Amino acid sequence: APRSVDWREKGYVTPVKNQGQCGSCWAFSATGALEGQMFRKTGRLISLSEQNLVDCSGPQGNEGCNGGLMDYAFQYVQDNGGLDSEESYPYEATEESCKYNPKYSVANDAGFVDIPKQEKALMKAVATVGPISVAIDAGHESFLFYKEGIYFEPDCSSEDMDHGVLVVGYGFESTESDNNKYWLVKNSWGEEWGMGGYVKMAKDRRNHCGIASAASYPTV
Numbered sequence: 230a231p232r233s234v235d236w237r238e239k240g241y242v243t244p245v246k247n248q249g250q251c252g253s254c255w256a257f258s259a260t261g262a263l264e265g266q267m268f269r270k271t272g273r274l275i276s277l278s279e280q281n282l283v284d285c286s287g288p289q290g291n292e293g294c295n296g297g298l299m300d301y302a303f304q305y306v307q308d309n310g311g312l313d314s315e316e317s318y319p320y321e322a323t324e325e326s327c328k329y330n331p332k333y334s335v336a337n338d339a340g341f342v343d344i345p346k347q348e349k350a351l352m353k354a355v356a357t358v359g360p361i362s363v364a365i366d367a368g369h370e371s372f373l374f375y376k377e378g379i380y381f382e383p384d385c386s387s388e389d390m391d392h393g394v395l396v397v398g399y400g401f402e403s404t405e406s407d408n409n410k411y412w413l414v415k416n417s418w419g420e421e422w423g424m425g426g427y428v429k430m431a432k433d434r435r436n437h438c439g440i441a442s443a444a445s446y447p448t449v
């Protein structure tokens with residue numbers, strides 16, 4: 230695999246969004262991965278509606294602002310036959326009744342692929358597919374205050390994740406501890422968090438924060 234990857238430079242990634250206080254991280258991670266695969270297919274980057282997923286993908290197993298799973302979102306887009314654009318179905322950060330309109334659908338998928346639970350397999354998928362939806366243990370104050378550098382939390386759990394995010398690449402930089410590799414991760418807490426809304430999460434450190442434990446992407 231390459232030593233560094235960044236799908237933003239290939240046009241695969243929309244700007245950082247903000248989920249607000251709604252527990253809709255799974256919808257932002259899913260739209261991010263579908264934005265990437267739709268761009269891969271059509272050459273057009275179109276921001277997708279997280280509110281569409283929050284309001285409408287309950288029958289696939291999601292629970293709106295109380296949480297959800299990216300794979301359930303991908304299943305919804307397949308079952309539903311479409312997904313509306315962000316512009317047509319904007320984000321309200323609260324659960325409401327479903328308002329999907331097929332006339333404004335701009336994305337589809339035919340299922341999803343679950344990556345094996347190893348960082349080596351996540352690296353291969355990131356290098357060859359595009360941005361990948363992942364779940365991480367983000368439940369630590371160090372994650373809230375992250376400013377720059379490679380994020381490493383000694384209390385992070387590799388098995389108990391609470392937050393869906395999007396791996397858009399990976400790379401390296403020299404560090405004091407010589408733990409130099411990172412996953413380049415797009416969050417959904419706005420631009421003021423982290424590095425413009427991004428975090429470099431420790432890579433190849435025993436599946437830090439569980440980043441390779443629930444990785445997947447839609448098939449387009």
Ligand SMILES: *C(=O)NNC(=O)[C@H](Cc1c[nH]c2ccccc12)NC(=O)OC(C)(C)C
Pocket residue numbers: 251252253254255290291292295296297298299300363364390391392393443
């Ligand atoms: C985000 O704003 N809130 N978190 C979530 O929605 C949870 C994210 C999560 C945790 N573990 C995951 C594995 C695979 C995909 C997403 C994952 N989701 C969550 O708590 O889901 C319910 C248990 C269904 C509520």
